[model samples]
Target chain A: LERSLNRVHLLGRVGQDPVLRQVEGKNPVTIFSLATNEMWRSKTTWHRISVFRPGLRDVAYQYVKKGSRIYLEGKIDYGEYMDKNNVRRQATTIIADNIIFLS
Target chain B: LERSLNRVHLLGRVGQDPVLRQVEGKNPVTIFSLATNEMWRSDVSQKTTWHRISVFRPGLRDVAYQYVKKGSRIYLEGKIDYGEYMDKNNVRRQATTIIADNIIFL
Candidate 1:
C-alpha cells in the first residue's frame, strides 16, 4: 500500500454568512458555521462546526456566501467551555487550514 | 480564532507484529493493525484499524519489531482510502483507506 500523511479534505457549503468581530489592538476576526451532509447505508446526517480566525475572515466573507460550495481542509480541535449558566460544555471543532471558493 | 487544517496525530501501540509481503519487483510492504483507546465519561473504547504502512529506510523492520512491543508507543500518519468491492450476495461494497506517510516508534 502507498503510504501518505494525515490530511482531511472536504467539499461542503456554508450554512450561514460570516460574523465579523474586532478586538482592541488586534486584527478583525470572523466566525461562521459550516455543514456537511452525507448519506450512507440508510442513514442521512449532517456535521456542523464553527470555523473562525482573524486573518482569513475577509477572504472568506468576500468569497463565501450562504449556500456557496467550498473546499475546506482543517484539523480537529477539541476543548471545553463554561456556558452562561455555569455549566461545563465540551465541544469539538475543525480549524481550517485552507479555504477554497468553489462558487 | 486560529484556523488550521485537518491533521490526525495519535500515539498508540501495534496490536501485533507486522506482516511483510513482497509483490514481484516492488519494494517490501508491511501491513498491521493498530488499536487506540480512549477513556471519556465513564466509557472506555478501543478503535482498531488496519494500517497498511510502508518503510524505505534501512533496518526499519528490525528496529520496529525488536524494541516496539505489543504495548509500545507508536505515532502514525495516514489518510483514508475509498474503493468498491463485490460481496457474496452480489452487492457492491465500499471501503476507505488511510495511506500512512510515516511511522515513529516512541
Candidate 2:
C-alpha cells in the first residue's frame, strides 16, 4: 500500500456547544464547530468537527462548551450530498480522531 | 497574546504543474494542488481529497516552481488559511488554502 497523509491539527476555541446524537444501530456521534484565528490579520477559520469514537465523543459532549479552548487532530472528510433545494453540496468536515481540552 | 495553532501536514502527489504568480508589490507565490488518499479496511477502497497549496516563502517558492511537477510526491508543512471572497457573479464564497512554510520532495 502506498503511504499518504491527510492530517490536520487545530488548537482553537469552540464555536458552539457540542451535541451528541444517538443512532439506532451505530455508535453515538458528537458534533461541533471549532474556530482558529490567523496571527497576521486575525482572520477566523471555522471547521466542522465530528467525533465518532465512543470514549472521545462521550468526554467531548460532557466537557466541551462554547468558547472552550481545545486541541484536536483529525482527517479531512469531503463528502457530497444533496440539499433540500436539489442542489448538490460539498460538505467538508473533520473526523476527529483525538481531542484534548486546553481550557 | 493567547496561543493558537492551525497547522496542516500533507504528503501526497502533486495534481498539476505548479504556477508562479508575481504581483507588483507583493511577494511571489507558487500555487499547486495536492491529492491525498485515505485507505479504508471495510471496503478495501480509498477516497481521495485534493488540497490547494500556496508557497509564499522567498527561496522555497522559486524552488517549488522549478522542480515540483505533476505527479511528483512531496511532503509539506503549512498552516490553513480561510477567507471569504466575492465572485464575478456577485456571489460570496469561502476559501480554504494552505500556506506552506516548507516542503520536502520525496
Candidate 3:
C-alpha cells in the first residue's frame, strides 16, 4: 500500500491554435484547447491543456493547429482566480508533460 | 488519426466513504472522493488535489461500494468526464469526474 501516482492521457483534436506566452521573468508556456468526444453518449468535453515542459512547449506551439489530432500525457491541476466582478472562480487545467502528433 | 483514446490512472487515498446510488431500472454507481499529492522540486512545498470518482462498471462498482472506506489506498483507471449543472443560484457550472472502469485495492 505504499505506491502512489497521478496521471492522465488523452487523444483528441485541438479546438484552436496553440498560443505561447512568454513572461519577462518566467518560462514560456503554450496553451490550447482539446476536445474529446465520448463514444457512447455522443458528447464532447473541452479541456484546457498548458504545456510548461520546455521542449514540448516550443514544438506544440510551432506545429499544432486547430484540427490536429494529438495524444498527450499530463496531470490535472486546479487553480483559483478572481473574476471581473471580484468573485472567486476555480480553474481546471491539464499540465501536459509529453505529446505526440497523431495525424 | 484513425484512433482515439482517453484514460486516467490515479493511485491515492480515499478521502471519504463510498456512496452507492441505484435508480430503478438503471444500473448502480459508486461515488467517492480521492486525494493525491504532488511534490514541488522547484521549491519545497507540496500540493494535494481532490478528485471526484464515479464507478460505473458493475463488478467494480459493487466491490468499491462495499469494501472501500475512508483512507483506503487504491488504484483506479478511468476516463475523464465533463458535466454541467445549474446550481441553486441559477448559474451554470462545469464539473469534472473520473468515470472508473477498473479498481484495485492497494
Candidate 4:
C-alpha cells in the first residue's frame, strides 16, 4: 500500500465530441479523445480520457467539441484485451478528474 | 497558435536500474522504465503498464545515477513524446514515450 500519486495533464484539441452514456442507478459517464502535439520536428501524442463525475461529465459533454482546445488532468489506468489477431493487447487509458476549455 | 501542455506524473516502481549515457561530447543522460498499475477486479495479472522514460536534465541525471534503482518507487513528472526512428533493419518504428522533467524518490 503506497500513498503515492498518478497524474496526467495535457493541452490539446478534442479528437471528437464527447459521447454520453446512461447506466441504471449510476452517475452519467462521458468519453472522448484528445491529441497533444509538440515539436522537435512536430509530433503528436494521443490520449483517451474518460469522465465519470456526473456534473462534470454533463457540462463537458455539452460544451466540449471536436477540434476544441482544452487543458485536462487525470489518473492513468491500464488494461488488457483480446485483439483482432486473437492475441492479447495492452493499453493505457486515462480517467479525468477535471478539464478546462481554453476558448 | 496553441498554448499547449503535455504532462504526465507517475507513481510507480522502477522496472530496472537506470542506464547512464554520454552521447558524443554531450551531457550525460539517464533512461529507465516505470511500472504503474490500475487495481481492477479481483485476480490481478496484467494491470501494470510500463512507461519508457528518459531524463535529459544533467543535474537530475546525476542524482538519478547515484540513487535510483530497480524496484525503487518514485514520483515522476514529464512530457509525453511521440517519434519515429530507423532501426537496424532500416525499417521505421513509432515511439510513443515519456520524457522526464522531474523525479522524486519515495
Candidate 5:
C-alpha cells in the first residue's frame, strides 16, 4: 500500500535499548520497543511495540536509548512464525518510516 | 502528555468476517482482521498481517454490520488504545489496539 495508507504516528518513551540485527552480516537493522500511554480518569494504558524497517532501522539504533522520548512514523505489520513444535505464532509490529529524537 | 497523539489511519481489505458481540444486551462491539499489503519495489510480501480494529459506537456498529466482511477494502480513522485484558486463554495480557472513530468502505 505505497500511495495508500496504514499510517501510524506514535509518541512515547523507548521501553529499552534498540535491538540491532544484521542481514547476512551486511544490512544494519534496528528494532525498538516503543511505549505509548493514554491516561484517563482512573488509569493509564501502555502499548507494546516492535519496530523493524530497512532504512529507519539503523537510524533508531544510532540515536535512541532506553526511556528516551521520541516520535515515530510507520505502518503496522502483522506477521507470524512457526516454532519448533510447529505452533504458529502471530504478532503485530510497526515498520518505522521516520523517527524524531526528542531531547 | 495529555495532548499527546496516538492516532492511526488504515486503508485495506477485511481479512475475515467481523465478530460482533453485545454487552448485557446493550452495548455493541465489533472486531475485524484487516489485511494491509505493503508493496516494495522488488517483490510482494505474501505474508499477511491482520491488524485488529475495535468498533464501539452504536451508529458505527450498525454500519459495520452491514458492509464490513471478508475481502472488503476499507478506510479507517482512529486512535491507538492500550489497556489491560484477560483473554480466553486466561492469561493476563496488555491490549494494544485502534479504537475506530470513523469507518469507510472503499
Candidate 6:
C-alpha cells in the first residue's frame, strides 16, 4: 500500500479584508492573509500566508472579516519567476482548502 | 508585508529501521515514514507520510540513530507534494508527501 499526506491547519485572525477577483464567467475567488504567532524562549515569531482558492475563499469572505478568528487547512506551494526587473524571484503560498470561522 | 509559511512538526517513533539509498556518486540519503495518530470523539485517526528527507552533511544522521530510540519523541519540519501516477490497470492515481527539513529529538 502506498499513501501520502499534505495537510496544514492553523488558527489565527484575518489581517485584512479578502481581495476578490473574477475569471472569465466563473465564481469569484478571494485572497486574504492570516497571521499566526508562536512564542518560544521569551521570543515571539509571526508567520503569514497569502491564501488563494475559490470555494474556501468564498467561505472566508462571506463569513469572515478582518480581525475575525478562524481555523484553516491548506497546502503549500513554491516556485520562481522573473520579476519586472528581469530578475528571478521566488514565491511561496498556501492554497487554502477549508476555512472555519471561529469567532 | 509578504510572507508564506509551510511547516509540519511531528513527534513520533520509527516504525521500522531507516532505509538508506545512494544516488550515482552522491552521498547516501535516508528516507523513512512516520505515523501520526489523532483522537476525537472516541475514535482514532491515523495519517502516514513517506518522508523523502536528507541532510547535506552526514553528522546528524549518525547522531540521530545513536541517540533516538524506537519510541523516542522527534520533532520534524517538512513540506508537502501532490501528483498523479498510473495504476496497474492504467488508471491514474494521485498521492502526496511531506519533504522534511529538520528533525530534533525530544
- Top candidate when judged by DockQ against the true structure: 2
Better of 3 and 6 by lDDT: 3
lDDT of 2 by residue, A18-87 (tens): 9876547876879889888876644787777888775788888888889988888987664444556553
Clashing pairs in 2: none
Off by over 4 Å in 6: A1-3, A22-28, A42-54, A84-93, B1-106
| Model 3 TM-score on a 0 to 1 scale | 0.79
> Rank order by lDDT, top first?
2, 3, 4, 5, 6, 1
If you score just chain A, what TM-score does every candidate get?
Answer: 0.60, 0.77, 0.75, 0.74, 0.66, 0.64
Tens-digit lDDT track of model 6 for B1-106: 3333435544455555555556788776555555544332325555443333333347655554455444444555653332334548553212223444446555
lDDT of 3: 0.74
If scored against the real structure, what TM-score would every candidate get?
0.41, 0.78, 0.79, 0.66, 0.72, 0.44
- Candidate 5 chain A, poorest ten consecutive residues by summed lDDT: A85-94
lDDT of 5 by residue, A1-103 (tens): 3335678887777777877765476766566676666665753334445545555666677777888767767765533445575534233346655556664
Q: Candidate 2 residues B1-106, lDDT tens each?
A: 6777877888899899998877786777899888998877646787788787888777788888899999999888887654345558553333345566545665
lDDT of 3 by residue, A1-103 (tens): 2445778888888899988875468878788888888766447777778887767888888888998888888887654445665543243455655565654
- N/CA/C clash count, model 6: 0
Per-residue alpha-carbon lDDT of candidate 4 for residues A72-97, written as tens digits (9 for 90 to 100): 78765533445565533233345555
Model 3 chain B lDDT-worst window of ten: B89-98
> What's model 2's lDDT at A57?
82
Candidate 2, residue A15: CA error in Å?
1.5
Error of 3 at A12 (Å): 1.5
How much is A98 displaced in model 2, in angstroms?
3.3
Q: How close is candidate 4 to the true structure, as a TM-score?
A: 0.66
Question: Candidate 4, after superposition: displacement of residue B41 in Å?
Answer: 12
Candidate 6: deviation at residue A88, Å?
5.1
Provide the overall lDDT of each model, using Cα atoms, as 2-decimal numbers.
0.47, 0.75, 0.74, 0.68, 0.64, 0.49
| Predicted candidate 4 versus true structure: per-residue lDDT over B1-106, tens digit per residue | 7767777777888899998877788766687888777655436534566676677766677777788889898877777553345558653222334455555665
In model 1, which runs have C-alpha deviations exceeding 4 angstroms?
Answer: A1-8, A22-27, A43-54, A84-87, A90-96, B1-106
- Evaluate residue B6 in candidate 5 and report its C-alpha lDDT on the 0 to 100 scale: 71
